[PDB]
Each structure stands twice: as C-alpha cells, then as structure tokens.
Design a protein around this ligand. Structure first.
Ligand SMILES: O=c1cc[nH]c(=O)[nH]1
Ligand SMILES: O=c1cc[nH]c(=O)[nH]1
Ligand SMILES: O=c1cc[nH]c(=O)[nH]1
Ligand SMILES: O=c1cc[nH]c(=O)[nH]1
Ligand SMILES: O=c1cc[nH]c(=O)[nH]1
Ligand SMILES: O=c1cc[nH]c(=O)[nH]1
Ligand SMILES: [Cl-]
Ligand SMILES: [Cl-]
Ligand SMILES: [Cl-]
Ligand SMILES: [Cl-]
Ligand SMILES: [Cl-]
Ligand SMILES: [Cl-]
Ligand SMILES: [Cl-]
Ligand SMILES: [Cl-]
Ligand code: NA
Ligand code: NA
Ligand code: NA
Ligand code: NA
Ligand code: NA
Ligand code: NA
Lengths: 251, 251, 251, 252, 252, 252
C-alpha cells in the first residue's frame, strides 16, 4: 500500500489529485509553506514529499531529482495514488539573447533530447503540455508581474554535452550536439532544461495533465555556469508562480 | 518577384500578414466570401489564392493540396511575400469514441507520421502550434457553440496504410503501422489528418505562427452515417470558426 | 464502387489497366488529347481524371498533385479500379553539369527523401521501377531523338530545404540537408523531383508496375536561363514520350 | 579554486582523491565512507551527498548519483573536473535469469543502452563497457567476500516501469519498443536490469575515465519466493564491503 | 606503380581490363576464366583469387569476392584503383517465391539493403540499384542461354541464417528485426535472398562504377532451408555461361 | 550425422572439440594447427579452411572466417551446430592511438558496431562485448608472451576503406557518416580498427557462446614509419602463439 520509491500511501495525500513537482528536494518544504497546513510526509533518495492545502483542497509537493528517469518514477507512483495533474517548476538556461535572468518560461512543447520519453511513446509523438495547465501557468506568470515567454524548450538528458557546454573535463561534445545550440537558437527554441520532454510525453500519452514553468538562471549567449547571486530571487518567483498556477487548476 | 508556384506577388497581397490555408482549392472562395472584398488572385496546380479584408486588414486565403509536401511550398512562398501567421482549417474524422460528428478539434501537437517535417527539424522537435493561435482557435470554436476538443493529432503522409486502413487494393499495412491506430487511441490521440505535422514543425522552427482547427465529420469508431444537414453545418461552422480565429489574431 | 477521392467508378475506366500520371491537373487533358476519343471523367481537389484510347485500348490519365501523399491516394484508388501499370511524367531540376535543359531522364532508382514510401516498405527497400516500364520509357525517349539519361533521382518531400535551396524566407537548411546537393552530385544522382520515391516504393511493394520519365526544366549548376521556346518544346516532348511508352506497354 | 555547480565542492575539498565510489542513494554515502578511515562530510545538494575518506592512506571520495543517467552524468563530470579518474558504481539489483539468486553479486561486463544520456557521449554503436581493471578488481573483491558472482550483460533502462517491462502500473501499457523485451533479453543471456550503468560506462569509456559496476540482487523477476529480511540486509552490507575492497585493489 | 593491399596485383597485371566478373567462391574464378581466351592466373590471397582473360579481344578480370559485403567492398575498391569500371556479379541464391524453380536465374533490379557495408557508401535512402545496361545485358544473356529468368527485387542480407529468417540453427532464434521478414518480403514481391548485391550495387551506383547481379537459384525456401547438392553443379555451370555472355554484351 | 553446408565438416570430424580458434586468413589455419599436436586437415571450401589438432590432450578446431562479419557469422553458426561453444579470434589490426606500436597486441574489451551483421543478432543498444573468461585468458597469454598489451575498445568496420576513414581510394570520398570519424574514435580512446569483432562478439554474447578477440598491430594510422619485414613476421608468429596459449587457459 506504500509506493515503492516515494514511501507514501494514498491516505497520506489526503485526497490530493494535483502535484507540484520541483526538482530539488530542498524546494519541497518551501513550496508547501506557501500553502496552508503544510505536512511533511516522507523523504527517500531524491524524493521528498509534503502535503498542503490550497483553497481548502489537498495538494501534494514531491521532488523529482534531476532527469527523466527519476521524474518518471515519481509521476507513475503519484498517479498510482490518484494524482492526475502535474505542475513542474524548475530552473533553466535561456538560448535566446532577449530572454533575461529572472524571466519565466512556460513550455509549449519540448525537443526530446532525452531517453525516457521513448519509454512511453515513439519519437514522432509530440512532447506537449496539457492546454489547461499551460494556460494556467501563463496566466499565473503574467498576473504575478513576471516577464513571461511561451515557446519550445530543448529538454536534455545531460547538463553538459547535450546543452553544448564546452567548459568541461574533456572539452568535447559528441557529433550529434556539435552546433546544436545555434541550431535550436535559429529555430526559435527558448531554453534548456532536463525533465520536460520526459514529463510531457509520459503524461500526454498516459491520460495525465502536465505542464512546465521555469525561471531563467543564466543566459547561454553569455556564459555556461550560472551565477549564484541571482539564484534565490529567481527561485522564489518561480515557486510563487507555480502555486498560483495550481490554484487555477483546482476544480 | 512572383513566387514560383503560387503565381502571385507581394503587391497582390495588399499587405496581408495572415493566411487561411484550407486543403481543397474549391474551399478558398467559400472562406474568402465570409470576409469583405474577396478577389481571386491565381490558380495554379492545387494552389488557388484569394485576397480579402477582415476588419479592414488584408488576409490571404490559399489552398495547400493534400499532404506536407504541397503544403510546405504554399507556406514558404507566402512567407517570402510577408505572411507570418497561418491558420489551417478543414474537416476531419476522429479516432476517440467521445468525439462526435460536428465537434471541433484544435490541435495542441501532432504525431509526426510525415516526411516533410524532417526537412525543417529533426524528429525530436515538437510539432506544436503557436500558443496565441491555438488560444484564438479554441475561443472562436467555443463561441460558435460547438463542443471543442484540445489535443494531439496523428499526421500521416498517407490516407490508407498510415491511417491503418485495410480496405485497400493489397489489404496489407506495413509493419511500422500495424497496430498503430489502437496505439494512438490508447495514447489519447484525437484524430488523423495529413498536413499538420509538416505545417506546425515548419512554422515553429521558422519564426511563423501556425495552428490547426477542424470540425469532425466522421469517426473511425462509430459505424453510423451522419446526416447531410450535419455535415453541411459542420463544414460551414469550421470556416466561420477559422475566420473568427483570424479576427482574434489581427486585433 | 466510387473511390473516395477520385470520383470515378470502375465502369468509368472502360477496362483500362494502365494510367499516365502527371503532377499538374492542367496537363491531364493535354495528354489525353494526344490519344483517341479523350473523355473527361472527373475533377476533385488536385485530381483531374480523363480516359482515352491508345491503339484501341483504354488508357486513364490522372493527375497526382505535388508530393508523395497526394500521389499515394491516386495510385491506390486507381488500383482499386483495376489499374496495374502507372507511367509518371513530370518536371525535374538537373544537378549534373552534363545534363542539359531539354534532355530526358528515366529513373532507375530513387533516393527516398520522402515520408510516404515508409508507409509501404521500410527504408532498406529499393525505390525501383518495374524493369519493363523503365525499358519502355528508355526506348520511347530515345526514339524521340532526345538525349536520354538513365540513373538515380533524388525524391524530396520539399521543394526548398530538401533540395538545398537557400533563397528562402529563413535562408537556412536543417542539418540533415546541409551539403546534400553536393553529396548527391558526387554520388552521380541526376535530378531532384518530389514523387518518384513514394510512387516507385509503393508500386514495387504492392504488385503494380511503375516508372518515371521527366524533361529537365532547369539545371541547378548552370547560370544561363532556358529559352521560352526550349521549355515549350521540352514540355511537349515529355508527354509525347510518355504516350509512346504507354503504347509499348500495351499487351 | 572553483566550486562545481551541482556538487558544491572544490578540488581542495577532495584532498587529492582520484577515485570515487558512486552509490545511487544519498543515505548510503556515509555507510560506505565509514568503512574507510577518517570519513568527513563535504556537502549535500539535491541528490548529491559527498564524503571524503582514506583507504590505505589514499583519499577516496564517496558521492551519490541519484536515480538515472542524467543525474549520474553530472556527478561524474563534476568529480572529473576536480581530478577524479576512477569511478566504482555499487548498489543492489534484481535479476532476470533463474540461476541468479537474491543476495548474489553481478559485475557488469557490458550494458544494453536503454537510456538516453549515453548518446550524449557516444553514438549507439559504441559499447557501454567497463574498464577491464575495474571489472577484474570487482570480480576478485566479490569472490573474496564469499558471494556467488556472475559476470555478464546488464540491461540499463531510463525507466523503472515500462523499460523494465512492468505492467502493474497506472496505465498497464508498455510502449511497442519494450513489449516482449524482458523475454528477449533473457534469451540473450542478460542478467539484470538497473538504471545508470549504460550512461556511466559509455560516458567514462569515451572520456578517458575508468569505471565499473557491481551490484547485489534485491529481486529475481522470475522467482515467486520473497527473500527474508536478514538476507536482504546481509546483501546490502556485502555490496558495500565489496566495492570498498575493489577500490583497495585499484589503488595499490 | 602500386600493388593493391589485398588482391596482390598491379594495374599492369590486368593488361588494360576495365570489366571484371566477380563470383563469390575463389574456386569459380578459374572456371569462369577458362570460358574466355588466354586465361592467366594472377594472384591468390585470402578469399581473393584473380585471373585475367580475353573476351572478343578485350581484357577481362575475374576476381572472387568471398562471402558478404565487407570482403566484396575490398575487391571492388582495389580493382577500381587498377582501372576496372564495370563489375558483373554472379552467385547462388535462395528463392522466396513458390513459382521460382531451382536452376532458374534471377537478375536483380534493386536490393533490399539488409547489410552494413552499403551504409559506408551512401545513407539508407539511396537505392541499391544496378546499372541499367548491365541489368539489360544480364537479362538477354540469361534468356539466350535457355534459362528461365526472373527480373525483380532481391533481399540482400549480411547473414545466411537469421537475416534470411532461417530457424534450423544452433539457437533457433531470430532477432525481432527479422521475425516475420521472409513472409513480409514475399508479400512485397521480393524474389530471392543473397548476401552481396546491396553492398555491390550501392557502392557502385554511388561511385561512378557500373554493376549488376545475376544468380542461379539453388534452393526454394518454400520447401527447405539447407540447399541440396544434387543440381548445384548444373546450376553453377549455367550461371557462369550466362555471366560471360553478359560480359560480351557489355564490351560490344 | 549432417555435414554443415559451408564448412563441409561433420560433428565426428571435430573429435569432440568444443573450442575453436578462428583466424581470418585461410592460410593461417595450418600454421596455428601446427603449433599444437597431431594437426589434421579437415576441409577447405571458399574462405573456410578447417583443421583439428590436440592441445594438452583435448581436441581443438581451427577454422578461418574470411574478411567481415557476414562470412564470420556463417563459420561460427556452423561450428556451434557441431558442438563448439568457445571461439578465440586472432586477426591483424590497424592501431589509431599514438601510444600503440606495431608489434603490440590488443585484447578487445568491447567493439564499436560499425558493421551490419551484429544487428542480425541483437539491436544496436546491445554491447559487443567479449566473454570475461576469454578476455582474461587472452590478456594473460598476451602479457606472458612478453608483448606490450593494450585492453580497450575496438572500432569494427564493414569496410577497410571509407569506414576506416581512408581517403587514398578510387573516389577519394568518404560518406558523411564517416567523415571525421577517425578523430572522433581517437578522442574517445578507441585503440584500433578491424572488421569482424562486432559481429563475432554480438553474435556470441547474445547466443550463449563464449568469444574473445586478440589482434596483432600491423600498422599504426598515426605513424609515418613503415614497419620492417622482420617486425611483421615476428608479430604474425607471436599473435598465433598467444592465441594458442589463451586456448590452453580456457580448456577445462
Ligand atoms: O543552463 C541550465 C540551467 C538550469 N538547468 C538546466 O538544465 N540548464
Ligand atoms: O479519416 C480521415 C478523414 C479525413 N481526412 C483524413 O486524413 N482521414
Ligand atoms: O528544381 C526542381 C524543378 C522541378 N521540380 C523539382 O522538384 N525541383
Ligand atoms: O528490478 C529492479 C530492482 C532494482 N533496480 C532496478 O532498476 N530494477
Ligand atoms: O538461400 C540461399 C542460397 C544461397 N545464398 C544465400 O544467401 N541464400
Ligand atoms: O588498418 C587496418 C589493418 C588491418 N586490418 C584492418 O581492418 N585495418
Ligand atoms: Cl528545481
Ligand atoms: Cl479543406
Ligand atoms: Cl507559442
Ligand atoms: Cl506535370
Ligand atoms: Cl522489374
Ligand atoms: Cl545505492
Ligand atoms: Cl559464387
Ligand atoms: Cl588472420
Ligand atoms: Na535523479
Ligand atoms: Na490559452
Ligand atoms: Na498535393
Ligand atoms: Na532493358
Ligand atoms: Na568473406
Ligand atoms: Na580479469
């Protein structure tokens, strides 16, 4: 009756059918405390799980860890317990010169640079969000006063070569990814992160509602390693937006 | 300059930056006449081109023919002549039992079962619409009184084997497509058509805004025959909806 | 009894088992009038259909539109009505310096740069003409007095990026097609067009005889512009050649 | 002097370590480190808990990877930036062959690349294989512990559920690519499923880094019996004793 | 002045030959050469036995390829460095259509590329098709010999066993890719299986060389998997008479 | 019992052998057999020359493969039908790393699958890896001989020319897939090129057969010096002494 990795039961969720799924286990309590009656449920591996209440309805907050594989486990196990809507929040690197640190991006579709999406649907299938979730995320971001961009997200199984970073141990990027950042830039792609392709393909092919919003922590036309100075303020804004987006999805 | 296939010049379009692109040449005049001052511009091969005025702004109506290849020529040549927004309309058959004849579908992403999309972006890239166009299409469709479905469309380079039809000369479907209709049904795909993967991938990777709307006229899962009045109503409603969606994009 | 797109019945074809399939609906009547007793049968979308008599035998002439998708519908529906041999006549761009405007090309195999051929056979399968049809087309083309080239044709789902054209709205070509025209030139490929890969693969995997012949309307390597008179003669010779090739196929 | 972005440590923090033991679970990091001398906590950020210890007088890092190739690839790269050149993966696992019993140990000789991150280092043709010295040391350490040791191929999946052909799930569906896959791997002699070795081995073998994987079997997909609690606890303890003894063999 | 790496012959050794007949079995080389005038042994190294001869006063090379695209690609390349521009393949084959009889001939109009070496010359989209004049010469030579000749598509496999969907093997298994493949090709109208035409035709058609393939049917897969030796000599004698007359038509 | 179709031998002809040494060149078969006791010629057909000998009182087969995965796959299959379970490949190789000299030996720990026949046994994700016992025996035999021995990844190509990125050819062209590929493999630490290991190791690892590859370096693609005849002859002799000693270590 406890799910295998997350360590929670259906009763622990207290009726929740919506989950906010940040990446970092440390963001879980912060998100829960933006809501009412936050309650710690479990922590195992990269999965920290809280419940809280938003306009009187239970919401679960569960970290995913980095990457499609760990995200896919959390989504499956939460779905087993009745969760049907998944709101992903995370950090991201902008590809376009005009998208600045602190701006918010809402993904309209993901470039599938991952492996786990292929475990749910063949490559032809679109990694696209639920329209209601994407609409809620746009409205929450805009209502908050943020600068918001809607568009395509390149979603990579690596932080380093698949985002065409060269300041690395080998300084090498495999042929597939050489020139890839400028290719995505010329195609209008807004940003890089590491989970949206898996999450959106999995949910869109499995009857689950999902969307992604992310705060820009670096502009890749400038540099490869994000500055620490701006991380906390961008993170605070993103989680305020995602909780408001959850409020708009409650029925 | 006159573009190679469409036979029109930039001056012929009178400043239009938006095009409505049906598949059937005979539907071009029917769409144009819902607007002010429709004028025939050209007809060559499958490309019949009219200009009209909507709220005082010039709009193009141009047929695409069947399939991504002929669609890709029309979109490119119109873009050479200043068009930046492309609204695809038609009627369609559904593959989900809950979708009824006369309902509308607004595509949120396409399964790329085509070839021409690969001439613009590798298969990983999402065949997704511009979010403003999809939003305007949803609103216009709802305001028509129709029941509207937002969701994924399977976009095939064939009418017969790629839609898993067996009632054919050979009665065979190649390995790739055996079992495919049930596969898409179980992944929540709403419908089949033959152009959206090429159109959406081309435009999303080229800085052009695109979307697709279709009224439903048949359903692979419901064996009954719809009434003539309903099919006539659905055709009329689809084109009223696309023109109202264009009005929302120009505003 | 009436096929879904072409609008004709088996009886309308008066026993024809051979069709000549140009791309452009306006060339159908021209081809039919080179034969005896031409009869208009139907026009719907890009499909204009005539019948005529050649040495006392019925022959269908049916346009395909541009691209594999629209071609695949016409071939299927004609095969449902008893047609077994398909002769494709069409325009092409030569990419070899020794091939001049006005020469003929008879395709011995196609580079499958399309999507619809994969709806009939996996990529490993050769896009190959029927040997009797290719033999008949070579003989007809040579007997006309034309200079005739037998060889490989690159068959693309786009006119622009898949033929490595840069004079376009974006001026970009996706990675797959960058450098591709020089690649095909160095591999001895003669020309680009947009339907032979689908046609030849579909027919060679479905028990239908097919072949393709084309007059060269431009050479991608020559800066000189062809005479209006030269293009006119080339158009006329191409259709006289395909009718002669049809004569040689009748049994 | 830089601190690497995800792990939050500097080169000086590692005290000269050129070998890392990389379990998946952050809670297992301290448990491995305490088998060595002078264990010290360095950092914990996200799924990455980092300790340093000393083995026969040499510095060794212990750093968790999280689940899956993506988070693993970050840890390996950032440790390599700080001088680490040898990576010893440890963990427990479930087998797909009837002759491999719970509590047995598997040393991977190559991985089926059912992941995505391996493709960010080398095209699919490239073999996901371990360094031969690491695999040799892992085999010897596993045998010296008294365990039954199997050398062979591991299927390394980006999912726990469909990519391991599990049907007891929310949708109950497995995509076409993975339908029949478990039987296919069983008939090809594959030993086990796990979720990180394809990425780890391909990344390292293509980047001048020495890597290997050793695991304890925590389930056998073909057996009805359920292992007892003592057996599972013994297998956990044995797997980390084994990887520390394999490290000792690599340092000498 | 060069001696090619594998064939062990120089351009002077070929006495001006621009046409080669390329059987697979080295023992067939002398048999083909003796159907022509003034045959001379040139070299034998590995699976490559090379003779020259004269046909209608013109020099002709005969060189074995061995089995498979890789060894064929070496012989074709090295002969092309020494001036050969036309390559006539003769070999044996298994029919996959019930009406084709043992002893019939097949002239390939295009090959299903079930090989790997063709991809070393052109991507998979490129058609494995013969030169039209060679195919035409082979059809006419085959008809004129009295044989029953079929023109059509050939499935060209890198293996004799699983890629031809044979089950009478050590494991009895066929990998997923090839399960059902023989019936799939049969329903697509494919005539036969062999092992070199995909590589040869793709290499040549993408390299400015003229090539074609003719093969004698030694088995029909409607009946059995292992060919009978009974009529093998008869089929082989007819096949080589045909290929020499096809060469005569190409020189004319 | 039956005579296998290509090799032309029966189970009784092998006198109980369950281990085969499989060189590439048919002329090397007798030389290997004569390093053992009581060598007996069994058959020669096409590229397949087959001998039997005795090693420490046990029957061993020696069978050539020809060049390439396709002809290798036939020999391994037919030997397996006759009871062979362990296959020791010896062959020549071109090194691509500057540190690997002519006369050194390479023992493959995994192959880059630049072939087609491996895909007839397992999908591309599957690793082309050796049996751990065979690789261990080859390393020991090679090191005990006094040779300098390298363990690592081998690029296994269906061509000698474009798939090894040679431009010194009739067209001077290398298809897009292989342009830049030698530097890519060099930077990924790949040791050498040959033409059979991917097929052999994938086939065997997915079919319950034990296989490994050892190779003598006959050229280095990064070196301008040409090796002298004496060095080449010594390398040839050492490679077959090594493979015989590795067989000795595999006998039970
Ligand atoms: O550049 C960035 C920043 C955050 N997360 C990513 O994946 N990439
Ligand atoms: O089934 C159908 C109906 C309309 N258009 C399509 O492409 N398929
Ligand atoms: O260049 C050309 C000319 C005609 N048709 C094509 O497809 N391309
Ligand atoms: O079955 C199992 C057990 C542990 N880890 C996995 O990935 N699969
Ligand atoms: O069946 C057969 C016979 C000969 N050669 C082949 O490749 N297959
Ligand atoms: O360079 C070389 C030398 C021998 N064998 C090969 O395959 N390549
Ligand atoms: Cl996060
Ligand atoms: Cl329409
Ligand atoms: Cl958008
Ligand atoms: Cl035309
Ligand atoms: Cl034919
Ligand atoms: Cl762990
Ligand atoms: Cl032969
Ligand atoms: Cl050898
Ligand atoms: Na993780
Ligand atoms: Na909206
Ligand atoms: Na069309
Ligand atoms: Na002919
Ligand atoms: Na061979
Ligand atoms: Na060892």
């Amino acid at each position: 009756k406890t799910v295998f990795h997350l360590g929670v039961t259906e009763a622990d969720l207290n009726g929740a059918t919506l989950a906010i799924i940040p990446g970092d286990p440390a963001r879980v309590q912060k998100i829960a405390e933006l809501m009412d009656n936050p309650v710690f449920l479990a922590s195992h591996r990269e999965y920290t799980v809280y419940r809280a209440e938003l306009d009187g309805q239970s919401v679960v907050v569960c970290s995913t860890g980095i990457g499609g594989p760990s995200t896919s486990i959390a989504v499956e196990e939460l779905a087993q317990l009745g969760v049907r809507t998944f709101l992903r929040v995370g950090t991201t690197g902008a590809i376009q010169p005009h998208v600045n640190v602190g701006d918010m991006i809402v993904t309209t579709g993901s470039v599938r640079l991952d492996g786990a999406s292929l475990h749910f649907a063949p490559m032809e299938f679109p990694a696209v969000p639920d329209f209601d979730v994407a609409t809620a995320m746009k409205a929450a971001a805009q209502e908050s006063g943020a600068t918001v961009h809607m568009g395509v997200t390149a979603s990579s199984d690596t932080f380093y070569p698949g985002q065409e970073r060269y300041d690395t141990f080998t300084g090498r990027v495999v042929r597939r990814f050489q020139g890839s950042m400028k290719e995505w830039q010329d195609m209008g792609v807004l940003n890089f992160e590491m989970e949206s392709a898996t999450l959106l393909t999995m949910c869109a092919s499995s009857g689950l509602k999902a969307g992604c919003v992310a705060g820009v922590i670096i502009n890749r036309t400038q540099k490869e390693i994000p500055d620490h100075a701006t991380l906390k303020e961008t993170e605070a804004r993103s989680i305020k937006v995602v909780v408001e987006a959850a409020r708009k999805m409650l029925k």
